[PDB]
């Protein structure tokens, strides 16, 4: 629907006022059919729109919702280094060991993208640095050579 399209666009842009006008019990968990089925919460999380993330969560957005590739909004936040968003999602019950269709977890994303504080947050909440994705790679395996601090963090040493 045009309304849902406008809502998804508003979530992506961080347009709080438009989100408030279009967010209904029926649209809060709508999906971008013409993309990868991101929900408003995926868009707000991935584009670091904190106020929108907050509003959506308050109004019943599903923190556990998977997109077409099996990503939850915590994946989006972690891949793009959005620490506050990640913390809000975890506080609202997001599963940290969640795995997409390729068995990538949020820790795989944070590690690969060089996000130390987010890795630390995930580990504090029980994220498993030993979980292999479908390629057989752990999050540690995906750490860039230059990020020796992240390597040490995930090694527990």
């Amino acid at each position: 629907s045009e309304a849902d399209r406008q809502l998804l666009e508003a979530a992506k842009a961080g347009d709080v006022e438009t989100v408030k006008k279009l967010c209904t019990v029926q649209s809060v968990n709508c999906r971008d059919i013409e993309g990868r089925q991101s929900t408003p919460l995926h868009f707000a999380a991935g584009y670091n729109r904190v106020s929108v993330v907050e509003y959506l969560l308050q109004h019943g957005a599903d923190v556990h919702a998977k997109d077409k590739g099996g990503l939850v909004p915590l994946h989006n936040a972690c891949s793009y280094g959005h620490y506050e968003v990640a913390e809000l999602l975890v506080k609202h019950g997001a599963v940290v060991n969640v795995a997409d269709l390729w068995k990538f977890t949020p820790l795989h994303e944070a590690a690969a993208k060089g996000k130390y504080e987010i890795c630390k947050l995930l580990l504090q909440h029980g994220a498993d640095p030993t979980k292999k994705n479908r390629d057989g790679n752990t999050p540690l395996d995906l750490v860039k050579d230059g990020d020796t601090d992240i390597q040490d963090l995930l090694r527990g040493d």
Binding site: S38, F43, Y47, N76, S79, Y80, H82, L101, W102, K113
Partner: peptide, 13 residues
């Protein structure tokens, strides 16, 4: 099948 990235980006700018 390509694993495409999540919707989003790291820098708002």
């Amino acid at each position: 099948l390509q694993r495409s990235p999540p919707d989003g980006q790291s820098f708002r700018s």
